[PDB]
Write an enzyme that holds these catalytic residues in place. Structure first.
Site, mmCIF file in Angstrom:
data_model
loop_
_atom_site.group_PDB
_atom_site.id
_atom_site.type_symbol
_atom_site.label_atom_id
_atom_site.label_comp_id
_atom_site.label_asym_id
_atom_site.label_seq_id
_atom_site.Cartn_x
_atom_site.Cartn_y
_atom_site.Cartn_z
ATOM 1 N N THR C 55 0.832 -1.203 0.000
ATOM 2 C CA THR C 55 0.000 0.000 0.000
ATOM 3 C C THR C 55 0.868 1.255 0.000
ATOM 4 O OG1 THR C 55 -1.513 -1.295 1.425
ATOM 5 C CG2 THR C 55 -2.053 1.004 1.016
ATOM 6 N N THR C 56 1.887 1.270 0.861
ATOM 7 C CA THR C 56 2.778 2.420 1.001
ATOM 8 C C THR C 56 3.595 2.671 -0.263
ATOM 9 O OG1 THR C 56 2.892 1.881 3.362
ATOM 10 C CG2 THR C 56 4.508 3.448 2.549
ATOM 11 N N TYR C 119 -12.558 -3.659 -2.917
ATOM 12 C CA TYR C 119 -13.679 -3.199 -3.742
ATOM 13 C C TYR C 119 -14.773 -4.246 -3.964
ATOM 14 C CZ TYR C 119 -16.255 -0.879 -7.569
ATOM 15 O OH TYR C 119 -17.235 -0.314 -8.370
ATOM 16 N N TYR C 145 -2.936 -10.168 4.611
ATOM 17 C CA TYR C 145 -2.913 -8.751 4.965
ATOM 18 C C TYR C 145 -4.350 -8.253 5.038
ATOM 19 C CZ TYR C 145 -1.875 -3.680 4.225
ATOM 20 O OH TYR C 145 -1.793 -2.304 4.251
ATOM 21 N N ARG C 150 -9.423 0.059 4.045
ATOM 22 C CA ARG C 150 -9.074 0.274 2.643
ATOM 23 C C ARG C 150 -9.775 -0.680 1.683
ATOM 24 N NH1 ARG C 150 -4.738 3.391 1.284
ATOM 25 N NH2 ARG C 150 -3.443 4.180 3.006
ATOM 26 N N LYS C 174 -0.703 -9.754 8.525
ATOM 27 C CA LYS C 174 -0.420 -8.366 8.821
ATOM 28 C C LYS C 174 -1.768 -7.721 9.091
ATOM 29 C CE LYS C 174 0.944 -3.925 6.607
ATOM 30 N NZ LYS C 174 1.189 -3.329 5.312
ATOM 31 N N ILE C 215 5.256 -4.467 9.825
ATOM 32 C CA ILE C 215 5.456 -3.980 8.468
ATOM 33 C C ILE C 215 5.095 -2.499 8.537
ATOM 34 C CG2 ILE C 215 4.593 -4.001 6.079
ATOM 35 C CD1 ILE C 215 4.319 -7.174 6.585
#
Ligand SMILES: NCCCC[C@@](N)(CC[C@](N)(CCCCN)C(=O)O)C(=O)O
Ligand SMILES: NCCCC[C@@](N)(CC[C@](N)(CCCCN)C(=O)O)C(=O)O
Ligand SMILES: [Mg+2]
Ligand SMILES: [Mg+2]
Ligand SMILES: [Mg+2]
Ligand SMILES: [Mg+2]
Ligand SMILES: [Mg+2]
Ligand SMILES: [Mg+2]
Lengths: 296, 296, 306, 296
Positions: C55-56, C119, C145, C150, C174, C215
C-alpha cells in the site's frame, strides 16, 4: 388507533437563575400555536429531560397542557427512562396531568435486548390509555429498536401507534412502512423531514421548529397534502439551518439560536450541557441571518 | 496522587423478589476479597446502576464499605450520572459514607461536549477529597471523553487519577500513557486486560472477575510484576469466557453465569434487562464448563 | 489430498522489523536509482525485511511492469545480506494475485504479502478460496494482509486460522485493523501463527501480545528506531520497546494525517531522502497546513541520512 | 449539460467455462431494452469489473453499444479505476467505441484526498466529450466524494453531470440537491430508489432490474412523472427482493437469482467471488416466489 401526528416541536426548556423560566415556557408554546404547529413535546431530548427533576418534568407538562387547552394543539409528553419502573411512573403522571399522549425514548445506557425493549414498552403501554409513540435514537441511547420489535409492539399493544426515528436510515424507514403501513412514522431528524414524509411518514418532532415553527409546519402540511414540490422546497431551504443546529450536541445550538433571536432571556444550560464554542456561536448566528424568524 | 488500582470487580447486584438481596451482596463481596481482588466497584454498569433507586444505590455502597473494613480491599463506588448535579450528590454520599474513591461514567444520552465533560468532572472532583476515576464507554453513553480532555482533567484536578477505558481502542491507550504517563489507565474490557496492562495500565475493573476472581486477580498481579508470559497465558485462556459474557448486553450473561454456578439464588433483573435467550443460556453454560469456578 | 493439520508443520516465516517501501517517482517514472538507495539505507539501519509495492508503495497506480521492476530491484539489493524481500502481490482478482505470486517466486522474492481483495467484497468462503489458490501456486511463504478500512472487507479470525491450518505456506497475517481484541483472539486460538503489526502506533501492544514483527510506514523515515523497538520486544525487553513506541507516537500518528503514503513521502522529501514530492494520481501533495504539521513533528526525531 | 438519466441497469456479466458468454450478454441486454429500461451500464460493480481483463471489459462495452443500436437505450459504460491513468484510458476507449457516457467509481483502496479526487475526475472529464457520472460507494472504496467536491466537479467540468450514490445517506442526498439542484442524482441502492427519486433524483442504476426490469422501469418512470404514490407502491413491493439481493455481497445474490430464474445457464463467478451459502441460496429462491419474473 388513536394517534398524534403532524408538525410537532420538541420544546426547549428555558432556564432563568438556574430555574425553569415558566413564563417564557408558556410564551414559547403560544408562539408555536400561532405558527401552525399541531402538537408540542415538553421534556424530550431537546428539553434537557435528563437533567430536570421530576418536579420540573411535571411543571413543564402542566404548562404545556394548560397553554394548549382550548386550542387544537396536542401535548405529546416526554416520559422515557432507562428504567422501566421510572418510565411507567412518568407515563402515568403525564396522563394524569392531562397529556394527549406520551413520547418514550428507548432506554439509554443499559442496552436492553430486543426482548427487553418489548417488555419495557409493553409495560409502559399497559399503564395508560393514551397513545404511546416509540422513539429510536441509537446515537444517544446505545441501542436500536429493530423494525421487527417496532412492528410487534404496534400490533400487540393498542396504545402504541408509531415511532419517532432519529437514525439517519431511510432504508429502515422504507422497511417499517412497507411491512406495517398502518403505523405513524415520525421524523426525528430535521434535515431529512421531507424524505421521511414523502415515503408516508405522518409528522415530525422537530428541533428547528423551535426557531422557525412556521416553516417546519408548512413543510409538514405541504407533504401531508401531497404537494411534494413545495415540501421539498422548504426542506431544501432549511438544510443549512437544520445542519448548523447540530454543530454541537442538541440542544446547545437551538438554545443558542433562540437566545440570539431574542426569544429567550438567558443562554443557560444545565451541566453537563454548556454554551457552544466561540466559533460555533458565530456559525449559528451567521446561518440564522438567511431566515426570517417569527417574533412573539 | 492517591490512587485505587489493581484487580477490581464491577459487582453484580443480586435481586430477590424484586429487592436487593443484601445478604447475598455481602457474601459475594467476601468471596471477591478471599480470591485476591484489590477493590470492588458497587453499582457500576454491571451492577444495574441505572435501574436502582437512590436508596438502593446507597445501601449497596454501605454494604461494600462495611464488608471491606479490616482488609486491604478498597471500595471504588459507582457515582456517575447524565446530570452533573446528581453525579455530585452521589459523589458526596459515597465520600461521607466511607468509600475509598469513586468511579464516574461519562454522562449518557445527552452527549455533552468536551468542554461540558471538563466542567462536569471538575465539579465532581471539587465536591470530594477522595480519588476519582473517569470512565469512558462510548458504546453505552453516546459520547467519548477525548484523550486531551482526560489528560487535562488529570492534570488540573488533584483527585482525578486516571480512566477506566471500555472503548476497544489500544491506539488511544498508547496515546494516553505516552503523553501523560502518570495517569492510572484501567482496563474496562476483559478480553484486552493483558494488552492494556502490558502497555503500563495499572488495573482492571472486570466483569469476568465476578465469576473467576482468582484468575483475574492473578492475571493482573502477574502483569503488574512484568511477568507478561504468565499474565498473557491467563488472558488467552480467559478469551472464550470473556467474549461469551457479552453475547447479550452486560450484565445479562454474567448474572446468568453466577446463577448457573449457584452463586446467586435467582436469575432476576430489573426491566428493561431480562433473561437471555434459551440458546444463549445454554451457550454460557457450555463455556463455563471449561473453567474452574471458586465457591464460597 | 489436502488436509487440516498444517499448523505445526514446518512453515518458512518472514518476521522481525520490516518496511513498506515508498516508491519514489522522478518525472512520473519510477526512480530506480533512488529506490535502490532507499533500500540500502533500510538494510544499513537494522531492518529485517523490505516490502516492495505494498500500500505504502502505491501498488494501485504502478503498471504491472513497474511492479515487477520494483520487486527485482528489492531482490537484487538485498542479495548478500540478512534482509528478506516480502513482495507485495495482492489483487482484487484471484487470477492477478496468482500471477503476481508466481512472478515473485520466479524472481527470487523470499515471500509474498497478499492484501485481501479490495472493492469487490468477497465472502469468507471467497477469501478462503482466493488465498487457497494463491498459496497452492507457489512454495514460498505467504503473509495475509487485513486492512478493512481500505478494502471494504475483513478476513475473519476463523478464516485466517483455517487458512493457516489448511495451507502449508500461509504463515500469518499483517493486521491494520485498530482491533487489539482481534489480535488477542488470533493468538489465543492459534498461537503458532505470526501476527505482524500493520499499524505503527500500536507496534508495541501487538508485539507484547506475541506478535513477531511489524510492516512499518514510519521505518521509511526512522528505520533504526523501528528496528530497535522490534528487536527489544522480540527479546522481551518490553520496557525499552515501549519507551520507543511511546516516543514514536507523535510521528506515527502524523504520518496518517492524510492517507498513507501522502505524509510519509512528504516527510522523506522534507528530510532530503527523495528528490521530488511526486505522487501518481489520484494521490497528490498534502494541504499546506498538513505539510507544516508534518515538518513540525519531524523536529523531535533524529533522522538518519544515507 | 448533456445527461444520461432514467431507469438504468448495472448489467451482470455471465460466464461460461470461465469466459464471458457473449451471446448470453447480448440476450440479457435485449431483455432489458424490451422491459422499459432507459440505459444499461456494462462492467460496473455488478458486472464484476474488478476481475475482468481490459480486453473483456472492452468486449462487454462493445456488445452493449451494438445491442442498443436502433433504440433509445443509452450505454453508460463503467470506466472507473484506482489509477487515474487507467480511468482515463477506459474513458477514452468508451468514447471511441460509441458509449453514450461513462460511469466512474471513486478510486478504491488507495483513499485519495478530496483534492486528489478532484484532480482524478478533472483528468477523466477532460479526456472525452461525453457525459461523465460520478459514483460514490464508500463501503466498497474506502473513500467518500464529499458534497463539496461533487458540486465543484459538476460546476467546473462541462462533462460531469451528477453522481450515482450508494451510501445509505439520505441526508447527503438532500445536501447535494439543496446546494446544486441542477445535478442528476442517481440512486445506486435499490431499496431506497423511491426516496432518492422523490427528493429530485432523476434515475437509478439498479441491481434488482437485472431480475425485474419492468418493475424498476415502471417505478422510475412513475416517479419522474410525479406519480409518487404509484412509484412508492412498487418500491414497497420490491423491498423484500431488494434486500435479499444483498444478503451476500452483490453480485452473488443477483447472479444466483438469474440462475434460479433460468436467465443464465450456469452459476459461475470469477474468484474471489463464489456461490452463496446453501442457506442464502434457499433464502433467495424463497423471496423470488413472490415476484413475476419476465422471461426472454
Ligand atoms: N426526566 C427527569 C428524571 C431524569 C433522571 C436521570 N437524570 C437519572 C435516572 C436514573 N435512572 C437514576 C438512577 C439512580 C441510581 N443510580 C439513571 O441515572 O439512569 C435520567 O433519566 O437521566
Ligand atoms: N499492482 C499493480 C497493478 C495495479 C492494477 C490495478 N490498478 C487494476 C487491477 C484491476 N483488477 C483491473 C480491472 C480491469 C477491468 N476493469 C482492478 O481495477 O481491480 C489495481 O489492482 O488497483
Ligand atoms: Mg394543525
Ligand atoms: Mg459510574
Ligand atoms: Mg537473501
Ligand atoms: Mg481454534
Ligand atoms: Mg538480544
Ligand atoms: Mg492513524
Amino acid at each position: 388507533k388513536n394517534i398524534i401526528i403532524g408538525a410537532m416541536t420538541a420544546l426547549i426548556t428555558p432556564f432563568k437563575n438556574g430555574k425553569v423560566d415558566e413564563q417564557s415556557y408558556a410564551r414559547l408554546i403560544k408562539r408555536q400555536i400561532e405558527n401552525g404547529i399541531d402538537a408540542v413535546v415538553p421534556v424530550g431530548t431537546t428539553g434537557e429531560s435528563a437533567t430536570l427533576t421530576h418536579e420540573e418534568h411535571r411543571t413543564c407538562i402542566e404548562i404545556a397542557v394548560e397553554t394548549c387547552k382550548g386550542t387544537k394543539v396536542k401535548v405529546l409528553a416526554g416520559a422515557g427512562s432507562a428504567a422501566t419502573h421510572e418510565a411507567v411512573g412518568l407515563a402515568k403522571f403525564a396522563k394524569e396531568h392531562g397529556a394527549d399522549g406520551i413520547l418514550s425514548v428507548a432506554p439509554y445506557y443499559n442496552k436492553p435486548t430486543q426482548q427487553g425493549l418489548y417488555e419495557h414498552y409493553k409495560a409502559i403501554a399497559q399503564s395508560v390509555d393514551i397513545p404511546v409513540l416509540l422513539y429510536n435514537v441509537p446515537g444517544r441511547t446505545g441501542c436500536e429498536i429493530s423494525t421487527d420489535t417496532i412492528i410487534k409492539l404496534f400490533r400487540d399493544c393498542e396504545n402504541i401507534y408509531g415511532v419517532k426515528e432519529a437514525s439517519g436510515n431511510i432504508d429502515k424507514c422504507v422497511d417499517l412502512l412497507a411491512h406495517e403501513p398502518r403505523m405513524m412514522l415520525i421524523s426525528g431528524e430535521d434535515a431529512i423531514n421531507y424524505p421521511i414524509l414523502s415515503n408516508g411518514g405522518k409528522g415530525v418532532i422537530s428541533v428547528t421548529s423551535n426557531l422557525l415553527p412556521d416553516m417546519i409546519s408548512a413543510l409538514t402540511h405541504f407533504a401531508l397534502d401531497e404537494n411534494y414540490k413545495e415540501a421539498k422546497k422548504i426542506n431544501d431551504e432549511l438544510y443549512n439551518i437544520n445542519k448548523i443546529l447540530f454543530c454541537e450536541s442538541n440542544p446547545i445550538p437551538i438554545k443558542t439560536a433562540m437566545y440570539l433571536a431574542g426569544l429567550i432571556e438567558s443562554l443557560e444550560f444545565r451541566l453537563p450541557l454548556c454554551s457552544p464554542s466561540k466559533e460555533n456561536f458565530a456559525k449559528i448566528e451567521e446561518v440564522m441571518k438567511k431566515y426570517k424568524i417569527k417574533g412573539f
